[PDB]
Amino acid sequence: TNTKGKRRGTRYMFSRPFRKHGVVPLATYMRIYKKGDIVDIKGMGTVQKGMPHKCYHGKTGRVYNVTQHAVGIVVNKQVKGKILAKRINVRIEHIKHSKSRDSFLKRVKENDQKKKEAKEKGTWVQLKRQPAPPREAHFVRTNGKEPELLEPIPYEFMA
């Protein structure tokens, strides 16, 4: 039976990468989280105040509270049969903005551009995405030179 200790098994998780030890460079601290920012948690060894628990590393969630130098952040943690949305108080250093949402906002902005225009025109445009369709009919010109023959090569033992 294994030890219940808080930091058990974070030998690798909380360990600054190769040649990225030392001073926590300052952008990290000086970037602003509001309420409802989508934020991915990633514990860090240098800063031990406000560390998240090893279960929430990797996990993404939303900011609910913002204190002086930390951010309350609702994240969903599964427990055997039940997913528990729960609220944890991570110090900034263990947290980035999750880009996952921004590619969405880019698309909605692009849609609002393509909805305003193409209204006065009349031609309705494809706003929905569509999965990669089968690759269409097309010609391939074997331009002058014929195809290159590939015989499989005879075995030989190298070692």
Binding site: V140, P147, E148, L149, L150, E151, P152, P154, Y155
Partner: protein, 175 residues
């Protein structure tokens, strides 16, 4: 791979074009298989080994059956192999005598099963080349190279053993 009687297929394909490589080179093969479906698969297997190129990364351009151009000639075919033993992997040069390449490769696949308990999926056919009377290294072939060939069909054992299941006459096997 399994079998039945194979057909030569021509299969040419290319790693599909990109920004960086706009008009990529075509690669052609001789892929013996029971049908185009497994032909194309077999094409991809051989190319994967040789070239950094997968079914996802490429497109088969032209798969097409290839017909023996001299069906009603009797030929001698040299065939080079690459089988897998229980032990290590090997090379051979088999020789068959047949009316077709397909027939000659089919013939090979049966022989290899017989003589080496080698199953389809172990065998790689590299080259199949029709060959003269000479340049035939195997005496099992060479004995049929002769103008006035002459042999009997000596102990001609009967079939139709159950047309008359029972009969008065003891049979005959001299003809």
């Amino acid at each position: 791979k399994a079998s039945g009687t194979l057909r030569e297929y021509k299969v040419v394909g290319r790693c599909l074009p990109t920004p960086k490589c706009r008009t990529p080179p075509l690669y052609r093969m001789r892929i013996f298989a029971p049908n185009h479906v497994v032909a194309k698969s077999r094409f991809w297997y051989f190319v994967s080994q040789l070239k950094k190129m997968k079914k996802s990364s490429g497109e088969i351009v032209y798969c097409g059956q290839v017909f023996e151009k001299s069906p009603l000639r009797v030929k001698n075919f040299g065939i080079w192999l690459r089988y897998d033993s229980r032990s290590g992997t090997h090379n051979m040069y088999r020789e068959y005598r047949d009316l077709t390449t397909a027939g000659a490769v089919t013939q090979c696949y049966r022989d290899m099963g017989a003589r080496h308990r080698a199953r389809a999926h172990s065998i790689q056919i590299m080259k199949v080349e029709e060959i003269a009377a000479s340049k035939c290294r195997r005496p099992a072939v060479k004995q049929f190279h002769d103008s006035k060939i002459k042999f009997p069909l000596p102990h001609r054992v009967l079939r139709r053993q159950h047309k008359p299941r029972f009969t008065t006459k003891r049979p005959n096997t001299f003809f």
